[PDB]
Each structure stands twice: as C-alpha cells, then as structure tokens.
Amino acid sequence: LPQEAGGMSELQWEQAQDYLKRFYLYDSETKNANSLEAKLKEMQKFFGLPITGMLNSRVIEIMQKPRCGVPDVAEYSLFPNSPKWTSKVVTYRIVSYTRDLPHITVDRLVSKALNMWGKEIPLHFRKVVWGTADIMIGFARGAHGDSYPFDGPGNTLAHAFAPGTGLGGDAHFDEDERWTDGSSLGINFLYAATHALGHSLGMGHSSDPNAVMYPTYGNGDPQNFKLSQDDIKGIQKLYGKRSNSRKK
Numbered sequence: 155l156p157q158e159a160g161g162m163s164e165l166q167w168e169q170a171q172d173y174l175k176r177f178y179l180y181d182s183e184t185k186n187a188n189s190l191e192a193k194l195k196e197m198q199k200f201f202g203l204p205i206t207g208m209l210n211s212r213v214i215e216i217m218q219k220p221r222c223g224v225p226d227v228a229e230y231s232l233f234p235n236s237p238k239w240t241s242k243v244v245t246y247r248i249v250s251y252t253r254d255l256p257h258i259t260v261d262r263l264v265s266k267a268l269n270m271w272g273k274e275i276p277l278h279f280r281k282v283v284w285g286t287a288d289i290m291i292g293f294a295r296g297a298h299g300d301s302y303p304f305d306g307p308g309n310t311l312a313h314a315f316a317p318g319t320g321l322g323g324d325a326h327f328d329e330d331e332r333w334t335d336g337s338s339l340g341i342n343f344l345y346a347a348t349h350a351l352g353h354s355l356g357m358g359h360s361s362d363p364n365a366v367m368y369p370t371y372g373n374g375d376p377q378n379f380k381l382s383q384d385d386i387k388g389i390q391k392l393y394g395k396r397s398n399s400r401k402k
C-alpha cells in the first residue's frame with residue numbers, strides 16, 4: 155500500500171532520529187550515534203519488526219508515530235513533581251476549531267474523551283463556551299510560537315501543558331494535520347485527543363500493554379480498546395474517597 159515516508163527524500167531519517175531526543179527534553183540513551191543506532195534497533199524490537207536493524211521506511215513509521223514532540227517528563231514549563239489538578243471539578247473551552255470539519259467533531263469528541271476519563275475517575279468537567287476556563291483547547295497552525303521545529307502535516311499533532319492554575323492544562327492541536335470524522339482518510343481525532351487530554355489531566359505512560367497511552371499509539375480507530383485499572387488505581391487516590399477498612 156502507499157505511504158508518504160516511502161516517497162520522501164532520505165533526509166527524513168535524521169529528522170526522525172533528531173525528533174526522539176525532544177520526547178524527554180534530552181535522552182542520554184538517544185545521545186551519541188552509537189547509542190542512537192542501538193536504541194533504534196530497540197525500537198524495532200519493541201514494535202515487533204522481523205529485522206532489528208532494518209533500513210526500510212517502515213522504521214520511519216515507528217519513529218514518527220502519532221504522539222507529541224515535547225518533554226513528556228515533568229517539564230515543558232513544569233517543576234520536577236507529578237502534576238495533578240488541586241480539585242475534582244475542572245472546566246474546558248474549545249477556543250478554536252478546524253475549517254476542514256465542523257465544530258461538532260471537536261466539541262462532542264473532546265467531551266467524549268473527557269467522559270472516558272470521568273466515568274471511571276469522579277472528576278467533574280464543565281463546558282465553558284464564553285468565559286474563563288481551566289483547559290483552553292485550540293486548534294492551531296504551528297507558526298504561533300512553541301519551541302522545536304514548526305510542523306505541518308506529519309510528525310507531531312498536539313502539544314499539551316500539564317495541570318496549571320493559569321497557563322497550564324491547555325492544548326493546541328495541529329490544524330495542518332488532516333483529522334477525519336466520516337471520511338477515514340485522516341488521523342482519528344478522538345483517539346489522539348484522549349492522550350492529549352490525559353496530559354491536561356496530568357497522567358503518565360504505563361508499561362502495561364492494556365493501557366491506552368502506551369506509546370505504540372496509532373492513527374486509525376482501535377478495534378480492541380481497554381484501560382489498565384492497575385494504572386488508574388493511583389489516580390483514584392487523588393480525586394476519589396479513601397474507603398479501606400484500615401484507611402478511611
């Protein structure tokens with residue numbers, strides 16, 4: 155089947171390699187080319203490729219895989235400590251939206267993704283449409299001012315600030331990415347949106363392959379979505395009641 159990374163110039167691989175560093179600000183194991191190449195061989199194994207040390211655009215696909223291009227550690231304007239909201243009530247506002255698709259495809263899917271987190275965790279989410287809110291969600295073109303290289307269609311699709319009392323909590327989706335609703339020839343917004351919002355709620359990734367924000371995240375709509383309740387158990391301590399026989 156056709157894809158873009160098989161028709162783009164060889165330059166893509168060093169770009170995609172350079173990209174890997176920014177996921178943590180720095181990564182010590184992605185620094186030195188000896189280690190770059192050792193850790194890219196480890197990427198192929200983690201994803202399940204039949205050749206560790208393949209040179210094929212399939213390997214670019216695992217490097218550019220739908221996720222953000224930002225420090226996914228406490229950083230991207232944050233002190234060292236796990237972020238969480240200081241309440242169980244949070245608001246949100248769709249400040250902006252896409253022209254290739256009507257408003258619904260945002261407003262109903264951010265809400266639905268927040269509903270995914272907020273049925274399990276007793277988090278209340280209120281929609282603001284005029285006024286101040288906690289989570290300012292916008293769709294933007296990437297000339298508007300964030301660190302790192304700009305981005306259009308291709309690698310990187312949102313950034314998200316973790317729970318903050320002003321400037322934090324908030325996301326900018328990529329309006330130059332082609333998101334779908336009914337058409338299927340885009341990135342599934344609801345899918346992507348979930349971990350974008352998971353950022354806005356202050357969670358991390360999980361080693362459990364039943365987890366949603368497991369890094370081998372994709373573009374198209376899941377068949378077999380599930381949560382690790384094992385991860386969420388320590389989120390339930392932060393917003394939920396203490397109700398053990400020994401601790402209540």
Ligand SMILES: CCCCCCCCCCCCCC(=O)OC[C@H](COP(=O)(O)OCC[N+](C)(C)C)OC(=O)CCCCCCCCCCCCC
Nearest residue numbers: 247248249250251252253291292293294295297298326329
């Ligand atoms: C008979 C004449 C009719 C003319 C109709 C023109 C269209 C009227 C309806 C649409 C207005 C469009 C406004 C516009 O595109 O703003 C462009 C930018 C806005 O920043 P931008 O990111 O585009 O939009 C941000 C807000 N967002 C994300 C929430 C949508 O903001 C700018 O780039 C700066 C805007 C500076 C305007 C200065 C004052 C202009 C006065 C014109 C008065 C003419 C009187 C005849």
Ligand SMILES: CCCCCCCCCCCCCC(=O)OC[C@H](COP(=O)(O)OCC[N+](C)(C)C)OC(=O)CCCCCCCCCCCCC
Nearest residue numbers: 248249250251252253254255256257292293294295329330
């Ligand atoms: C007092 C007299 C009556 C007054 C009427 C009401 C006036 C209301 C003014 C509204 C100002 C709102 C502020 C603002 O940010 O407006 C932004 C708008 C809509 O934003 P939005 O709907 O978010 O789209 C954002 C821009 N986009 C597509 C690049 C992603 O951006 C636009 O809508 C862009 C407008 C582009 C117009 C370009 C020229 C079109 C030509 C029309 C004629 C064509 C003749 C062949």
Ligand SMILES: CCCCCCCCCCCCCC(=O)OC[C@H](COP(=O)(O)OCC[N+](C)(C)C)OC(=O)CCCCCCCCCCCCC
Nearest residue numbers: 250251252253254255256257293294295307329330331332
């Ligand atoms: C010599 C003096 C005059 C010189 C005038 C020259 C041109 C001045 C233009 C200034 C603004 C240029 C910016 C521009 O073209 O905005 C375009 C807008 C919105 O673009 P937008 O949807 O933001 O993104 C466009 C994506 N694209 C190009 C791939 C389709 O596109 C439009 O909004 C067109 C969409 C259809 C509008 C329908 C208009 C029907 C007539 C309505 C009459 C209403 C009562 C007045």
Ligand SMILES: CCCCCCCCCCCCCC(=O)OC[C@H](COP(=O)(O)OCC[N+](C)(C)C)OC(=O)CCCCCCCCCCCCC
Nearest residue numbers: 249250251252253254255256257258259260293329330335
């Ligand atoms: C830099 C400036 C360049 C020059 C600008 C020249 C004048 C431009 C006037 C505004 C053009 C408005 C175009 C317009 O969208 O007409 C149709 C709309 C909605 O049609 P719809 O298919 O929703 O939107 C099509 C356009 N799209 C894809 C670009 C969003 O119909 C509606 O949205 C319903 C509106 C009903 C209420 C109207 C109340 C205001 C009356 C006076 C408006 C005077 C406008 C100057």
Ligand SMILES: CCCCCCCCCCCCCC(=O)OC[C@H](COP(=O)(O)OCC[N+](C)(C)C)OC(=O)CCCCCCCCCCCCC
Nearest residue numbers: 252253254255256257259332333334335336337338339340
């Ligand atoms: C009675 C016969 C009528 C004949 C045609 C008249 C054309 C007048 C404008 C009609 C515009 C239709 C309304 C509209 O806003 O269309 C915008 C389109 C593209 O919007 P876009 O969202 O790509 O459509 C995507 C649709 N989707 C999501 C389902 C894939 O398109 C654009 O954004 C650009 C549209 C450019 C229009 C240029 C009009 C210049 C007219 C001749 C002017 C001569 C001046 C001397």
Ligand SMILES: CCCCCCCCCCCCCC(=O)OC[C@H](COP(=O)(O)OCC[N+](C)(C)C)OC(=O)CCCCCCCCCCCCC
Nearest residue numbers: 251252253254255256257258259260333334335336337338
């Ligand atoms: C002084 C400046 C002047 C500048 C221009 C001002 C005047 C502008 C006129 C603007 C009107 C444009 C309307 C237009 O583009 O309609 C397109 C339609 C399809 O619209 P459609 O895709 O349903 O709109 C979807 C929009 N969405 C996604 C937001 C829901 O297209 C159709 O559905 C076509 C249907 C044809 C049906 C059959 C008609 C038979 C006609 C036979 C006539 C006699 C033949 C001898």
Ligand SMILES: CCCCCCCCCCCCCC(=O)OC[C@H](COP(=O)(O)OCC[N+](C)(C)C)OC(=O)CCCCCCCCCCCCC
Nearest residue numbers: 245246247248249250280281282283284285286287288290
């Ligand atoms: C006395 C005859 C006057 C005849 C011309 C009157 C002109 C009226 C201009 C109104 C300008 C509004 C500009 C703008 O949209 O401001 C938005 C604000 C708040 O927006 P926002 O907070 O989103 O509104 C939320 C509440 N909502 C949806 C239910 C409206 O909305 C507001 O805060 C409303 C602001 C109203 C201001 C009216 C100022 C009048 C000074 C008149 C001085 C004497 C003139 C001879």
Ligand SMILES: CCCCCCCCCCCCCC(=O)OC[C@H](COP(=O)(O)OCC[N+](C)(C)C)OC(=O)CCCCCCCCCCCCC
Nearest residue numbers: 246247248249250251257261281282283284285286287290
């Ligand atoms: C004599 C009676 C007046 C008595 C005054 C008594 C004192 C009242 C003080 C009122 C204080 C509230 C002021 C105010 O903000 O009222 C807003 C309303 C509703 O605005 P709303 O739509 O809720 O918010 C809209 C957007 N916004 C905030 C950005 C401006 O504004 C509206 O409801 C007006 C809506 C006008 C839309 C008209 C568009 C169609 C015009 C014709 C178009 C023809 C096309 C062929």
Ligand SMILES: CCCCCCCCCCCCCC(=O)OC[C@H](COP(=O)(O)OCC[N+](C)(C)C)OC(=O)CCCCCCCCCCCCC
Nearest residue numbers: 250251252253254293294295296297298299306328329330
């Ligand atoms: C007649 C000789 C020439 C004939 C050919 C004309 C060809 C015109 C070519 C148009 C080229 C642009 C096409 C286009 O799709 O533009 C869409 C834009 C959005 O671009 P987009 O990348 O979304 O945002 C760009 C932002 N910018 C301007 C800060 C870099 O939409 C805009 O940025 C919205 C425009 C908003 C301007 C603010 C209007 C304020 C009110 C002014 C009222 C003026 C009355 C005199």
Ligand SMILES: CCCCCCCCCCCCCC(=O)OC[C@H](COP(=O)(O)OCC[N+](C)(C)C)OC(=O)CCCCCCCCCCCCC
Nearest residue numbers: 294295296297298299300302303304305306307329330331
């Ligand atoms: C009824 C009145 C309608 C007019 C109303 C007033 C509207 C005034 C708004 C002017 C908007 C200017 C915005 C602007 O400069 O943005 C840059 C755009 C497109 O940039 P773009 O191609 O996207 O590349 C820039 C962004 N990049 C590298 C990140 C991809 O554009 C450009 O790069 C090219 C700008 C070309 C201007 C050409 C003017 C030539 C005629 C001027 C008049 C001469 C006779 C007096």
Ligand SMILES: CCCCCCCCCCCCCC(=O)OC[C@H](COP(=O)(O)OCC[N+](C)(C)C)OC(=O)CCCCCCCCCCCCC
Nearest residue numbers: 249250251290291292293294295296297298299300325326
């Ligand atoms: C003679 C007529 C007098 C007209 C006087 C109008 C006074 C209007 C006050 C507008 C105040 C806007 C204040 C403000 O900064 O709002 C912020 C938002 C978004 O801010 P921000 O997210 O930084 O936008 C980032 C995107 N960037 C940097 C790439 C452009 O962006 C905005 O909300 C967009 C504001 C666009 C408003 C354009 C005003 C002219 C529209 C046409 C009205 C025509 C009437 C016939």
Ligand SMILES: CCCCCCCCCCCCCC(=O)OC[C@H](COP(=O)(O)OCC[N+](C)(C)C)OC(=O)CCCCCCCCCCCCC
Nearest residue numbers: 249250251292293294295296297298299300301304326329
């Ligand atoms: C009489 C009372 C008037 C009071 C009006 C109040 C206006 C408040 C506007 C707030 C607009 C908020 C959104 C805005 O910042 O858009 C910025 C855009 C592009 O952002 P960016 O591309 O990031 O450039 C940022 C830096 N800047 C502003 C120095 C160029 O910046 C640009 O694209 C520059 C836009 C330049 C103006 C184009 C419209 C001129 C209108 C011509 C009207 C002729 C009437 C006969």
Ligand SMILES: CCCCCCCCCCCCCC(=O)OC[C@H](COP(=O)(O)OCC[N+](C)(C)C)OC(=O)CCCCCCCCCCCCC
Nearest residue numbers: 252253254294295296297305306307308328329330331332
């Ligand atoms: C007759 C001889 C003199 C006239 C010479 C005219 C030369 C015109 C150069 C016009 C600009 C060309 C570059 C251009 O298309 O920039 C595009 C952007 C955005 O297009 P748009 O689809 O929003 O881009 C969205 C993102 N995308 C690409 C991923 C789909 O658009 C923007 O960012 C906004 C651009 C504002 C342009 C203001 C000038 C419009 C033309 C005015 C001509 C008036 C002549 C009197």
Ligand SMILES: [Ca+2]
Nearest residue numbers: 306307308310
């Ligand atoms: Ca992108």
Ligand SMILES: [Ca+2]
Nearest residue numbers: 288320322323
């Ligand atoms: Ca905020």
Ligand SMILES: [Zn+2]
Nearest residue numbers: 226349358359
């Ligand atoms: Zn993450």
